[PDB]
Amino acid sequence: STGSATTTPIDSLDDAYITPVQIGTPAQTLNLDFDTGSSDLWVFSSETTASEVDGQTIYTPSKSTTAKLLSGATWSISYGDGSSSSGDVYTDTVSVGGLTVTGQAVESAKKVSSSFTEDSTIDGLLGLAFSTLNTVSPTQQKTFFDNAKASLDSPVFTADLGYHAPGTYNFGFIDTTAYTGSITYTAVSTKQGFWEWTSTGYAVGSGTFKSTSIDGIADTGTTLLYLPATVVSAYWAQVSGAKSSSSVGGYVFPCSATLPSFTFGVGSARIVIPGDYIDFGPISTGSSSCFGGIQSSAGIGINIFGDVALKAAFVVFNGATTPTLGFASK
């Protein structure tokens, strides 16, 4: 089997992408944030505290003839950005782009943190990291991909995120028309539960490529590119007037600037992020200070190849017995 679904930016900055997901019978379609940096499929629901729902579409398990309470199971997650959610668990039928999994754990939120409530466009998350990170207790649950894997034509999914435009998540096949050149594959460590890999270096604009190992994770659920402070300083030094602002929370730059590209290495291959992808617009409405899309990871503990990086590539998440990642230009 295969599946193919379009993923759409939630706003004009590409802050996140939403993909429609059918849950239950009859289907309830919710728009979920596919997140290769986490491993829970959780949704706003009829159980979510009413004051914490503000415009999201909810899953109502009592209206699904295939829903079953997973008795005793609870979940609670905290994300790298400080947001969180928790609740109980149902199993139900879940379909993405025509690919159906029966008995998928659907984690129903009883509580969500304010950042989720305040984002009316995201009805939940669909985690695509390794199932070892799933938070369901006392019986850890598998991700949608883990459950689908055996049925898929090939045990892979691909992320093809758009710049200011829709893109595609495919399951079970690699669309050879969706990229240019060849796909370069690179080793993955699953020791932390992430799609963790080592980039071979970087370049700023037309500058020389610096060969250096940068361990990080491929994370579709993170907006920006978070890299070591040395790398980030080298990038922003090429933008007149750019500076790190402690009050804003990262590097800002004059909105009148033209940003240089940023290249990262995948083996001997190179992925070029155009400068425009690194512009996240005014820090507040009407400001002439703009927020940068490349930021320091120094306070995170891990480097994160988020959407800024991934949207410059066609990315293969190869879930074979020994997982690997593939990157192609497009």
From Swiss-Prot:
Keywords: Aspartyl protease, Disulfide bond, Hydrolase, Protease, Signal, Zymogen
Ranges where the Peptidase A1 domain occurs: 17-328
Active site: D35, S199
Disulfide bond keyword on record: yes
Single GO term (MF): aspartic-type endopeptidase activity
Catalytic activity: Hydrolysis of proteins with specificity similar to that of pepsin A, prefers hydrophobic residues at P1 and P1', but does not cleave 14-Ala-|-Leu-15 in the B chain of insulin or Z-Glu-Tyr. Clots milk
EC number: 3.4.23.22
Disulfide-bond pairs as recorded: C255-C290
EC main group: hydrolase
Gene Ontology BP terms: proteolysis
Domain of life: Eukaryota
UniProt similarity note: Belongs to the peptidase A1 family.
Protein name, entry field: Endothiapepsin
Organism listed in the record: Cryphonectria parasitica (Chestnut blight fungus)
Annotated gene: EAPA
Span of the entire protein shown here: 90 to 419 of 419
